[PDB]
Amino acid sequence: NPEDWFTPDTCAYGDSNTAWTTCTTPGQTCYTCCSSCFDVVGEQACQMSAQC
């Protein structure tokens, strides 16, 4: 869970769940959002997770 990661202070989504989830979806900034919805773990974790 992106509880220790994910920064809702610098992302549209204020939730780490919906954020990660909404991040792990088909779009234009699927892997780019992670770079704007995480720090290092959230991004590095969303990086591999992100199936885009």
Nearest to 18 by CA among 3, 32, 35: 3
H-type alpha helices, 1-52:
16-23, 30-33, 41-49
Token readout for 34 is 């992670």
Cα–Cα separations (whole angstroms), residue 38 to 20, 21: 9, 12
Q: Is 15-52 a domain of CATH 1.20.50.40?
A: yes
Elucidated via: NMR
**CA torsion through residues 32, 36, 37, 43, sign:** positive
